[PDB]
Amino acid sequence: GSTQFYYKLSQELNGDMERVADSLVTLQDQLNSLAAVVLQNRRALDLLTAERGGTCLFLGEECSYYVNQSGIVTEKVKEIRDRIQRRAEELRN
Amino acid sequence: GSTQFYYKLSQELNGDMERVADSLVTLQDQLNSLAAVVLQNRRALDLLTAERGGTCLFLGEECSYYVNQSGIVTEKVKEIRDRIQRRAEELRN
Amino acid sequence: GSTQFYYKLSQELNGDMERVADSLVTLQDQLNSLAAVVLQNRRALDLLTAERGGTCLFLGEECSYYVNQSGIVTEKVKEIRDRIQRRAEELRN
Ligand SMILES: [Cl-]
Numbered sequence: 403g404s405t406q407f408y409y410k411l412s413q414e415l416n417g418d419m420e421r422v423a424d425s426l427v428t429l430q431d432q433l434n435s436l437a438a439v440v441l442q443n444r445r446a447l448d449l450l451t452a453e454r455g456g457t458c459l460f461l462g463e464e465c466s467y468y469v470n471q472s473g474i475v476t477e478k479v480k481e482i483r484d485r486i487q488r489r490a491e492e493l494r495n
Numbered sequence: 496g497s498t499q500f501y502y503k504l505s506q507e508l509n510g511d512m513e514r515v516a517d518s519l520v521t522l523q524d525q526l527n528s529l530a531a532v533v534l535q536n537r538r539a540l541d542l543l544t545a546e547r548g549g550t551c552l553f554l555g556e557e558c559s560y561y562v563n564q565s566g567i568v569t570e571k572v573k574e575i576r577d578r579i580q581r582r583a584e585e586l587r588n
Numbered sequence: 589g590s591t592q593f594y595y596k597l598s599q600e601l602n603g604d605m606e607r608v609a610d611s612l613v614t615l616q617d618q619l620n621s622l623a624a625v626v627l628q629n630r631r632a633l634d635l636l637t638a639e640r641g642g643t644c645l646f647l648g649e650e651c652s653y654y655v656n657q658s659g660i661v662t663e664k665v666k667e668i669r670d671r672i673q674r675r676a677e678e679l680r681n
Contacts, residue, residue, distance in 0.1 A: 531652035
């Protein structure tokens with residue numbers, strides 16, 4: 403069964419990738435969640451150290467800034483999910 | 496070799512997915528690690544701003560809260576690892 | 589087309605895994621980015637609570653420490669990308 407092994411493997415791939423995509427989304431969701439807390443912490447610190455110019459000036463450091471890249475991961479996930487659907491679609495016609 | 500291409504591709508899939516699962520676990524481990532530091536930071540801030548009602552009241556903001564979803568990622572990883580084992584198991588009988 | 593299904597599935601796998609690897613890298617990049625902010629926050633707190641021994645002593649807690657594991661994820665990604673290249677290479681000779 404050649405045809406058969408092709409369908410089989412395509413569905414194995416698809417079922418693994420559904421779980422990977424799910425995981426990627428959830429890891430990104432947790433970064434987004436955690437970042438809101440971290441930046442609320444930073445704003446609180448900026449107020450506490452305002453007399454000294456806020457957190458970075460207070461320390462005598464260049465500011466570290468968070469670069470949120472949820473857009474990239476979200477895009478890659480949706481592309482993976484498209485590829486899953488396309489493989490199934492192609493087998494279906 | 497049809498049979499052969501099926502075994503081959505199944506093992507390629509399995510070896511890629513072992514590394515993906517490993518990565519997902521490690522990303523989750525780092526979120527868990529980092530979150531403990533962020534929340535210790537928050538508790539410290541809640542004490543420093545206690546006279547003002549803690550961090551959120553001090554800022555005049557609704558609190559941001561971290562939603563830990565390690566359970567979801569852990570579950571998806573273990574499901575991926577089950578699927579790896581099942582494919583190998585099926586080829587073995 | 590047995591040969592054909594083997595090439596096809598190998599390239600499907602490869603194109604999904606390129607996007608997974610990309611995602612893993614980006615999730616790690618965001619952890620690295622966020623961790624710099626969290627630890628700058630911690631250092632600021634250590635100064636504010638220095639009279640009390642820094643953040644952990646101030647709270648009466650054992651310190652929580654961030655364990656960065658970018659090296660692990662970076663390694664797994666590069667291994668996945670090697671496996672992609674090797675599959676293509678093998679089909680090419
Ligand atoms: Cl923080």
